[PDB]
């Protein structure tokens, strides 16, 4: 099972440097190169560089002087480091592996790391219940308010509840802080039997909240 | 660098129809093009390599053709799970470069939203802010209007909307409209109403509550 797992999303101050770790399994870094690709609003999908099996690196032209890729074959880890970030370096960063050892056909991707370049500070969210109230289908949810930066993960009943779930895109408030709601529809008859918990995780602030949502 | 131009920007079809994506290169690149699919909150997924070659685990309804500068990715019978963005990649010339992507939207029958309104929790009121949430669930098409009224006064500028991407199973959207008040303003009023207009409703639907009960 070929897999690539990246370190968590986070905030980097302007002019500061970015570090991401890509841990691979199901293959050996001595047999495959690992590529780095980002995806930004300004420039879309953008190939950044690669570290080959034998330790050599290639960097895309506009990144030659501020990009550094290293790895530890023993630990199956590839280390990405970019210097002097500005606002338009805000993007999702992926590590990726090609089908063959020499190629660029990216058949396996990491889950991505959203990096926000901002001078502001990290802030964890407050979680508030969206309580169901009086055709046999009830809607309930959680309000995840006033956090920075993106993203936040939301799940229901520790992953067991996925059907009917809608987690809305976050919106930026005038405060410069994000907010979103996650909703789910369930049978009215289950409100007295089943517990409904939204599991909220804001990794950039290490804030994890389980919010029980009950009829008021 | 090779410039890759994808067209159209947005594609919109019905399930079971065939659909094609175009990718054009600023100079000949042989057959050195790859295609990717990106679903909502997902990483790119490799669909085709070298213009026409299959990829393990990719459904047979995906195919590609072309050589030189004009390339085509095709889905011969679209399904709802194909709702995604699609990108091409060239690697005939260093560095490898990607197109800007084409969005694939699916049509479906009109579906009216189910409307729910949520008062602010007492927990949030402790903080000095009141959020009133109106939910429009599982509707199509995307266009809809939310009008807020507090004690018959039209609210303007103090609400924000967020819409999900299309559901991969039923192709509907859901919308949340959040009205934000100071706790002081919220306590000075009684009737909080959300009015929803949509093509699937013969009349606007209004969900409301009185602060308290």
């Amino acid at each position: 099972q070929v897999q690539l797992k990246q370190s968590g999303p986070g905030l980097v101050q302007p002019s500061q440097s970015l570090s991401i770790t890509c841990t691979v399994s199901g293959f050996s870094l001595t047999n495959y190169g690992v590529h780095w690709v980002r995806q930004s609003p300004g420039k879309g999908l953008e190939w950044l560089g690669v570290i080959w099996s034998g330790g050599n690196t290639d960097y895309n032209t506009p990144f030659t002087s501020r990009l550094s890729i290293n790895k530890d074959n023993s630990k199956s880890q590839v280390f990405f480091k970019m210097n002097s970030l500005q606002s338009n370096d805000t993007a999702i960063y992926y590590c990726a592996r090609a089908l063959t050892y020499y190629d660029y056909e990216f058949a396996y991707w990491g889950q991505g790391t959203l990096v926000t370049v901002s001078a502001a500070s990290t802030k964890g969210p407050s979680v508030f219940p969206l309580a169901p109230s009086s055709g046999g289908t009830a809607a309930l949810g959680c309000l995840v308010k006033d956090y920075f930066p993106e993203p936040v993960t939301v799940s229901w009943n520790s992953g067991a509840l996925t059907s009917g779930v809608h987690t809305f895109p976050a919106v930026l408030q005038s405060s410069g802080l994000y907010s979103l709601s996650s909703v789910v529809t369930v049978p009215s008859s289950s409100l007295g039997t089943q517990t409904y918990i939204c599991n909220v995780n804001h990794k950039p602030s290490n804030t994890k909240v389980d919010k029980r949502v009950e009829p008021k | 660098d090779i410039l890759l131009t994808q067209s159209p920007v947005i594609l919109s079809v019905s399930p079971g129809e065939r659909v094609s994506f175009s990718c054009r290169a600023s100079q000949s690149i042989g057959t050195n093009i790859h295609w990717y699919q990106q679903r909502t909150n997902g990483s790119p997924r490799l669909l085709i390599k070298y213009a026409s070659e299959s990829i393990s685990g990719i459904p047979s309804r995906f195919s590609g053709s072309g050589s030189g500068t004009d390339f085509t990715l095709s889905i011969n019978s679209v399904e709802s799970e194909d709702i995604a963005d699609y990108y091409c990649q060239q690697n005939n010339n260093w560095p490898t470069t990607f197109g800007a992507g084409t969005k694939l939207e699916l049509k479906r029958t009109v579906a009216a939203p189910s409307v729910f309104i949520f008062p602010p929790s007492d927990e949030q009121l402790k903080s000095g802010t009141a959020s009133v949430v109106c939910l429009l669930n599982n509707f199509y098409p995307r266009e809809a209007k939310v009008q807020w009224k507090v004690d018959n006064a039209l609210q303007s500028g103090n609400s924000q909307e967020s819409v999900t991407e299309q559901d991969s199973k039923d192709s509907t959207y859901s919308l949340s409209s959040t009205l934000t008040l100071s706790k002081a303003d919220y306590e000075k009023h009684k009737v909080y109403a959300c009015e929803v207009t949509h093509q699937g409703l013969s009349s606007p639907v209004t969900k409301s509550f009185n602060r308290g009960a």
Partner: peptide
């Protein structure tokens, strides 16, 4: 037409 970091989807 632009990539949206909130949804990883193209928006305008």
């Amino acid at each position: 037409g632009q990539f949206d970091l909130s949804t990883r989807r193209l928006k305008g």
